[PDB]
Subunit: 312 residues, 4 copies
Amino acid sequence: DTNIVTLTRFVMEQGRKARGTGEMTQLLNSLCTAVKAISTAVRKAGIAKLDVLSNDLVINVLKSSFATCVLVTEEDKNAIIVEPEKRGKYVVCFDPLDGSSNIDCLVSIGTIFGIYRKNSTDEPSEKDALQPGRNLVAAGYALYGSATMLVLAMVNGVNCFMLDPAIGEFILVDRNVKIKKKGSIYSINEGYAKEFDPAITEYIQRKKFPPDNSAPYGARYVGSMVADVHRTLVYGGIFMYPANKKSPKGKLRLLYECNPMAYVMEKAGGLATTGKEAVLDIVPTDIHQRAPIILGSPEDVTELLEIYQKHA
Amino acid sequence: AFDTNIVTLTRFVMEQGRKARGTGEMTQLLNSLCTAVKAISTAVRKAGIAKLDVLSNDLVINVLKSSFATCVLVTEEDKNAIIVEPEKRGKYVVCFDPLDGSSNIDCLVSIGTIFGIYRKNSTDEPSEKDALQPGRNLVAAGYALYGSATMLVLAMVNGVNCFMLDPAIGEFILVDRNVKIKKKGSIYSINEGYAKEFDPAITEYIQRKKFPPDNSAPYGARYVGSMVADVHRTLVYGGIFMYPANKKSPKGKLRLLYECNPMAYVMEKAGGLATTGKEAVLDIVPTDIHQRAPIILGSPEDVTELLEIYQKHA
Amino acid sequence: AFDTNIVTLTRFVMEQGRKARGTGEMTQLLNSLCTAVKAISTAVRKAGIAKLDVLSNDLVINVLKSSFATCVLVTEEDKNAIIVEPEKRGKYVVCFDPLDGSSNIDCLVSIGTIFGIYRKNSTDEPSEKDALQPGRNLVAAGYALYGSATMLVLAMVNGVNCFMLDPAIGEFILVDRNVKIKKKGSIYSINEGYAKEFDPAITEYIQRKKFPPDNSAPYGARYVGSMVADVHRTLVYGGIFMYPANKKSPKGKLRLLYECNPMAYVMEKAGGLATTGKEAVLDIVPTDIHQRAPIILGSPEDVTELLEIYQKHA
Amino acid sequence: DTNIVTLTRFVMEQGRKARGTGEMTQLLNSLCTAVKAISTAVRKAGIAKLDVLSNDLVINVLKSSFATCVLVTEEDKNAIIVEPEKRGKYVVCFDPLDGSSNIDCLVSIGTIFGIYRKNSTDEPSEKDALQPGRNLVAAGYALYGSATMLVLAMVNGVNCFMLDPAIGEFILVDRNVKIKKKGSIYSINEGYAKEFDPAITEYIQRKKFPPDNSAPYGARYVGSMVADVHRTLVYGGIFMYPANKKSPKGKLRLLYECNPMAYVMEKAGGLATTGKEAVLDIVPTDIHQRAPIILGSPEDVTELLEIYQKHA
Ligand SMILES: O=P(O)(O)OC[C@@H]1O[C@H](COP(=O)(O)O)[C@@H](O)[C@@H]1O
Ligand SMILES: O=P(O)(O)OC[C@@H]1O[C@H](COP(=O)(O)O)[C@@H](O)[C@@H]1O
Ligand SMILES: O=P(O)(O)OC[C@@H]1O[C@H](COP(=O)(O)O)[C@@H](O)[C@@H]1O
Ligand SMILES: O=P(O)(O)OC[C@@H]1O[C@H](COP(=O)(O)O)[C@@H](O)[C@@H]1O
Ligand SMILES: [Zn+2]
Ligand SMILES: [Zn+2]
Ligand SMILES: [Zn+2]
Ligand SMILES: [Zn+2]
Ligand SMILES: [Zn+2]
Ligand SMILES: [Zn+2]
Ligand SMILES: [Zn+2]
Ligand SMILES: [Zn+2]
């Protein structure tokens, strides 16, 4: 196509508008070089581990960006402070590879990240990451499945880019995504049904055998956060992964799994709560703390929310 | 990278066609299915920067024919079996759904091409009828998976072998020889949306996995909602994937012929007796080319634990 | 994009192996050469972000063998012809240089795999000797070109067909059927660095192209310096490509057997009598598996204009 | 490789050093999106024209760069003035596809370009392009052959990048290229031998039968500027395309064929002249004017230069 709208052309132009520096574009642009290289590596996984390559690659591409200064990773005890020569204004929390275990089974998997603006004057620190999900600038995810695709969420909107493998570029394909209001799918790992605190099980039964003599919802759980959420985004529905007994505080870590998806959901018009408060409104204390999460088409989450405040 | 000695499926299955003198008719056929399988996957990867199931079907028909190894073909998305227009004939019946879950692409869920292949027992004319051999007289079955990778798993009589498309050269090279599914698992796989309609044998089965009666580990659940997704996970890692029957689809949704069946041969040939509930899926003399028939498959002990309940409530 | 009906060389040549009952042994063989040809090209494209000729040879040997269509193989970069280690036997002699101009990569010039294939006239044992059939008893010859595209041109007995690697699916699909070279051209192609050593027949030939005696157009010159470059340009557009003999290489540089020869069959089968100067290159009973023999090829009239001078200075 | 040095990472960092804007990086980066897309299109040319796609694509990618303001093309009568909303400080003269005719024959072909800095205060104009080749900021070429490869020439050096097709990124492979001093190859279209003005023919014979009882040079002419020059660069040698009688002013247009290669040659330590003056020192009057050119390993060009001033 002689006028393809890459991610870079899309980013740079909204950047043109904030009358800023060009760092987000450097950051995003470098980030996508990690994504292509990981997409490529997941598509030949096992022609002869991974998540450590995956982590190295994204830390390196982000350091060279000349735009970060604290990078928080799934795979690292402590957060990373970018040499002064390479610092810039962003904090990126990311899980490089989420659900790495799944590659054997051939499950769709992904990278997830969120970018905070360091607003403070002192030395880069763990504290610059301990900012509420509400404050995020940009957040999104990279998905590796039949097609590699990037949903990027910024203050103006949610957009899906798709990697064209011929030209190694991400092309803008669906614009200004908004979710279906109520939907027909519930997603939860039902093997913990003996654990689902009584709000959930209610809604589970209430949807399977709908006592309103309605069509039951279908259920789906691919078991890789990213495919479950992407699906919830496009076809509408609800995904849930709440505080159960193996996992009393949810499983999904906050700064890099729960707050990006959340941010993406609300920008798209979905909601995402814990059933006790908003995922994005939490004030993190630990960079690696976890969350119960429930996100998806607003009425369904509103439905499960009635039940949470109709059971205490 | 840059390897001098790689077992490409053509080279692989050919080391099978000649040592056992089984003409390598298998080859030509398969080779062509590899060109279709690949071409479809390219398209699915650029999917939304460019139906499909239709064009996918037409391309599989069309390439198959020219492999000179067919006489009968059966699709999901087709009428009476196609009898090969006649010059390009040979001995096989390929029955297949080229794009399983053809909706699911747009939600970026993984989808596949299945195939069942038979050899012609009739020395009469190709008639749609010939398609209708039952399971256990199948020469080769497998699938292709358009996922994070394009994996074709082939199950012939000696065993199931998984394969993977190396995009850099366009070959399905080999990564798992004589695949054997595990003996017992931790996954039950079923669409529990339909929990009203579920026959009390499966409801017991679910209740024993979820809540184990003997106080142990709950079986974790997992249902992608693509038939080819759920079998592969269930194959390589091991589980009970169950699309039984229920009022909403009273004799299953899965068109036995090229779905429950091709899968099942891949299942049993690695340790997985795929049942209906009453009869095993391969012994069911095929009544119609799109005749449907319910299916619970997977690794041996999980099947069994349900068949006991099946045997105790009828 | 997304085409339901594409003539992949396997499908193509197979529509040739069965209508003429010529066992499709041709196929298996070729198909395997396609997997080598491709794999090498991937590597050349990432060349300098990763010898080669060696590994290229080993991979071509190794894939060939498993096509079950060989008994004798001859390389540039090899000793006595390899006799196939014996289980994988069949009827053909493939003689080939896998990486022609193997230096030229680093200057990013285009390079290729040639091949000559024969069928075994001996009902005795595979002996290196069997390799040694002359040109005119060749069953199929062609080359592959690692250029801006990977183009394999195949010349069998019915004609030359050019092919092109669609990287998106890994097939050499077809773009030029029954290729015929032009009758006369505007290109003379020779390494005039060596203008000292040039035998007075070629020096006349050059002087008639450069300066046309009859006051007309100077023949434009073009010499890539890769044998596979110079033939393709000379084939599709038409010219006289001449690596004659001279003191520095007294009976040519091009190892007749798998170079001047495989090219020449592709030449004559599209209108191009490739000569030595004295005998035509296909009639020369092959004295040794790397026996060299000079070559002037191309379209008919240009060859002729030189053979007259060849016929008038001896 | 978990720390690949892309072109962007290389550019951006030398840009870090001029304490500038980031526009060259935008320009180069956008330019490479044209190159990938053209490489891809040349590699499937004829599975069923081109240079018009090729031109459109590069003009569009350059307009969106937010860094040009005059773009001069092989395929356009008049130069192009970039809408004010999208102007920035660079002038890029480019031939998008050089030797397009050749694709049938399967010849290695390429894009060529040169980037001037508009120094003046008034409205962008044709005159901002009429600047001596000596003034160029950056220049280089993209080559499409067995591998697609970008040689980029900037004030600090000549570097070869190579496109990795897996990840769609250009990787820095040979650094700070310098040519061999004298070399063994002469390149000229000898079919014009009845036209070669007496300096050339001398040197032609002087090299073929070397009267110094020396080894003759080999000759090569692929007939696509770009493959000939790339080869001259790496293996050393000389390429020549002088004023002949069909073409009394050379054939190769100045601003986009002769001055980029020239610039690349000298930065690499080669020379390039007309045999009457330096190619880069010419003051163009026409944006589309042509040149006799002779460039390559210094001694060889010095050799042919003796002869030019030993024959008048
Ligand atoms: O390493 P990750 O990113 O946490 O990957 C596994 C994750 O953990 C979840 C699994 O949770 P359950 O098995 O408890 O449902 C998946 O959905 C997520 O991808
Ligand atoms: O619609 P197709 O192409 O036949 O494939 C979809 C299949 O049909 C099933 C849908 O059934 P539920 O969503 O009711 O479980 C999926 O599980 C299978 O993949
Ligand atoms: O060295 P190889 O691999 O045999 O291939 C190079 C060939 O050898 C010739 C070299 O001869 P000159 O450079 O002397 O013309 C080339 O024209 C041919 O491609
Ligand atoms: O359209 P372009 O860029 O000018 O392409 C043809 C060019 O013109 C030259 C041909 O000149 P001669 O045929 O006169 O040698 C080639 O080397 C160049 O690529
Ligand atoms: Zn993870
Ligand atoms: Zn995670
Ligand atoms: Zn289907
Ligand atoms: Zn189906
Ligand atoms: Zn060689
Ligand atoms: Zn050779
Ligand atoms: Zn041009
Ligand atoms: Zn030009």
